[PDB]
Symmetry: C2
Subunit: 57 residues, 2 copies
């Protein structure tokens, strides 16, 4: 029991560390997605202006 | 000691599950960001083409 308890505690702590790293990774990805979304929506505004001018011309 | 074994195993399981969930979410968001990046490049091309066309017009 003692040996197995030791090993289980060790591996669980390992998993905890990996999970924290995953948290940080997810934060990075979320920020970058926000950036790309802003770029795309502004791009859409540009396309709207493009098409409107094209129609007029 | 056995009571301690119970607690150790259970906390290990909690950590492992959370790690799994965070990993999956990271995967999904990363893939979406990559796709939108490709689309941002695509619309860069589209705006260039639009500038050419509006000039000719």
């Amino acid at each position: 029991i003692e040996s197995d308890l030791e090993r289980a505690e060790e591996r669980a702590e390992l998993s905890e560390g990996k999970c924290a790293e995953l948290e940080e990774e997810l934060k990075t990805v979320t920020n970058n997605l926000k950036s790309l979304e802003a770029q795309a929506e502004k791009y859409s505004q540009k396309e709207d202006k493009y098409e409107e001018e094209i129609k007029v011309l």
